[PDB]
Amino acid sequence: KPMVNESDGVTHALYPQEARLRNLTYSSGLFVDVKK
Amino acid sequence: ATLKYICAECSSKLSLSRTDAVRCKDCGHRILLKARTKRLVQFEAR
Amino acid sequence: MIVPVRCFSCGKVVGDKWESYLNLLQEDELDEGTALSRLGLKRYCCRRMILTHVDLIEKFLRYNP
Ligand SMILES: [Zn+2]
Ligand SMILES: [Zn+2]
């Protein structure tokens, strides 16, 4: 679900209302089991 | 006696100066408004 | 979006009648057509004013600080 990885802070569970005001991008993390 | 900024959610008169981060006393919510002017304003009542 | 004080058309006061009207509906279980006549709103210029208002202010209030 949406997250905001900003330096000087954790990673906030981002929300619409805020991404708009802050000019961020209401996106999220893409993870895949890379096997070697 | 006075104030300056505010927290969008946990509406709490806050404020500070340069390099004082841009967070709040509790709510991380890094938004912050800038509460009204003291110089009262007047209006045409029409 | 709050009841208009006075009707655009003739200017007859109507700011007060809001709450009264909302009752003549809910409580006194009447029909708009009559509730309006009850509040003394004669011609359509005054009628259309109340009958049509959309008290948005309420959804506004429901926000927070
Ligand atoms: Zn806060
Ligand atoms: Zn009228």
The domains of chain B are located at: 1-46
Q: CB neighbours (10 Å) of residue C40?
A: 11
Interchain proximity B28–A12, CB inside 8 Å: yes
Instruction: List the beta strands (DSSP E) in C1-65.
Output: none
Domain spanning B1-46: which CATH class is it, in words? mainly beta
Partner-chain contact B28 A9, CB within 8 Å: yes
Residue in chain B nearest A20 by alpha carbon: B31
Q: Give per-residue burial for C4-16: e unless 16+ CB within 10 Å, then b.
A: eeebeeeeeebee
Which phi and psi (to 5°) does residue A12 adopt? Answer: -80, 140
| Resolution of this structure in Å | 3.2
Tokens coding C49: 């004013």
C30, C22 contact by CB (below 8 A): no
Q: What are the extents of the domains in chain C?
A: 1-65
Please state which CATH number belongs to domain C1-65: 1.10.10.60
B26 touches chain C (CB under 8 A): no
Taking residue A6's Cβ as centre, other Cβ atoms within 10 Å add up to 13
Contacts of C7 (CB under 8 A, 6+ apart): C14, C45, C46, C49
Place of tokens 């300056």: B4
CA distance linking residue C41 with residue C44, whole number of Å: 8
DSSP state of A11: E
Q: Which residues contact A20 (CB under 8 A, 6 or more apart)?
A: none
